[PDB]
Amino acid sequence: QDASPILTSLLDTDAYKLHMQQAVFHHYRHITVAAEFRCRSDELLGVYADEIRHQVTLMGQLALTSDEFIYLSSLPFFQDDYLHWLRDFRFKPEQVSVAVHDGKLDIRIAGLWCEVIMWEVPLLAVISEIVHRRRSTQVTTDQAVQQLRTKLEQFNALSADIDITHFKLMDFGTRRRFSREIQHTVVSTLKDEFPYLVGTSNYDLARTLALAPVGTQAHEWFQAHQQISPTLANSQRVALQVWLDEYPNQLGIALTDCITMDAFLRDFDLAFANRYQGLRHDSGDPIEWGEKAIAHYEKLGIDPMKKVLVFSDNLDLEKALFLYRHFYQRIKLVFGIGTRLTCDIPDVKPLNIVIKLVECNDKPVAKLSDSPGKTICQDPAFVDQLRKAFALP
Ligand SMILES: [Cl-]
Ligand SMILES: [Cl-]
Ligand SMILES: [Cl-]
Ligand SMILES: [Mg+2]
């Protein structure tokens, strides 16, 4: 139905959103933030504004169900104070401003971080579904399934000569999925047909398909700490410590490129390297990055085979297999694939859209990374300050 909701579950979002939301609820309940939409491509999405606005209002109706509560209570991640608060949580549509200027979609979101944090993934998934169902009216679940099966055949062919049994794939594709139904179809097909699927970031699919919910933290956790910790140069160490404080023995993958990998390794001391299970790559050459990670573990006396590298920088299954060949004899590996799984249909172009943190406590925050052109920060002075504090060139 035209005006009917695209989203019907509060769990149709990525696990890292709830994992971070709980940390923010426990530690930073009164901190405010602002976040903004960007369309990375040369695309104009202004025409979709009214429909996006309508869906944003609809999201005000989403509410945790009792079955969902019981499911979350079964997992090792959640405390009951948070779960009781989550049961009362409702999106507040007023937090989201949708405007159009020169045909460009402008979306800004502002309010308490523990509330605002929940918008990013479902709002992106709603924008994605709105745009695709308008532009690509002929797409069937069958087309999506057949493309997936062709790729799984190519994967099997290219891996026949190696021990592929340590290959691990995560679905990370909620945000820019072609639609909710396409994601459901491809993830269910993977569970039934691909031994190496280890889980999905989507909490609703983790529950309903009986898969492990995966995902730890995201850049906003590190970025927000740039306006939380008194010392800017320590903001990433504080973010790593507060995460362990919240999750001492679960969710132990640290994202490495809010600043740069080199800066990260300067912060990643023996205690962090022992308590965390592993590291996630999101920018720069993955070969160089993985080698840096392995060498760091060796320098600290840690057996790299007892740690994990997570790769998820807009991967496809072929690139993931190539990375596996390079690293699998030396360290444990997980590969998160996003749009290449949930929006890979003949004659359909994926959208390159994001919603990223721009302020915390009314002050700028930024992600640098090891890839140029990934900075949304519109405060060049702050970016300069951040570079200085982290001793970057
Ligand atoms: Cl746009
Ligand atoms: Cl579904
Ligand atoms: Cl792929
Ligand atoms: Mg220390």
Swiss-Prot record:
Transiently phosphorylated on a His residue during the reaction cycle. Phosphorylation strongly increases the affinity for substrates and increases the rate of nicotinate D-ribonucleotide production. Dephosphorylation regenerates the low-affinity form of the enzyme, leading to product release. One of its GO terms (cellular component) is cytosol. InterPro entries: N/Namide_PRibTrfase (IPR041525), NAPRTase_N (IPR040727), Nic_PRibTrfase (IPR006406), Nic_PRibTrfase-Fam (IPR007229), Nicotinate_pribotase-like_C (IPR036068). GO terms for molecular function: nicotinate phosphoribosyltransferase activity. Keywords: Ligase, Phosphoprotein, Pyridine nucleotide biosynthesis. CDD domains: PncB_like (cd01401). Catalyzes the synthesis of beta-nicotinate D-ribonucleotide from nicotinate and 5-phospho-D-ribose 1-phosphate at the expense of ATP. Belongs to the NAPRTase family. This is Nicotinate phosphoribosyltransferase. It comes from Yersinia pestis. The gene is pncB.
